[PDB]
């Protein structure tokens, strides 16, 4: 399905990124990755401008990341958060075969610039990392995952 497809890419183009990797590692605790994943699913909605039906369900990506035990790697939230956002997106419309290559790089540019406007807010500092580059990284990381 298009959902595998999208969660599988866009979960090892966060995995690269330095932004995702930052935020989302063995070192983050449970309730600031969830609190942290809402604040940025509202990112994703008002990046991607979905329509407000579509843009509810992406919390379903909390509710993953909720599950996800501490201690895990950044792939796991990686994976958590990827597979519930495609999932969203395919069962709304939002992505097929037809449109998965725009849609992809588009959702991982729009995450990274999320986590990116939102992991200040729980003491996570990005000093080190040139944000505008992991962003403009993001097409060829996933040129590789896709």
């Given at each position: ?14 995995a690269?990124?330095g ?13 600031v ?12 909605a ?9 843009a509810?369900?992406?919390?379903k ?60 807010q ?6 080190s ?7 403009s ?10």
């Open positions: 399905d298009v959902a595998a497809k999208l969660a599988r890419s866009l979960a090892s183009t966060l690269s990124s932004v995702f990797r930052a935020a989302f590692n063995s070192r983050v605790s449970t309730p990755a969830v609190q942290l994943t809402d604040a940025l699913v509202q990112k994703i008002s990046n991607l401008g979905l329509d407000y039906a579509t509810s369900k992406l919390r990506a909390s509710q993953a990341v909720s599950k996800v035990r501490m201690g895990s790697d950044t792939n796991a939230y990686a994976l958590a958060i990827s597979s519930a956002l495609a999932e969203v997106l395919s069962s709304s419309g939002k992505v097929a075969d037809a449109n998965i290559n725009q849609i992809a790089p588009q959702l991982a540019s729009g995450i990274v610039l999320g986590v990116s406007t939102t992991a200040p729980f003491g996570v500092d990005l000093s990392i040139n944000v505008n580059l992991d962003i990284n993001v097409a060829r990381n996933m040129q590789a995952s896709i």
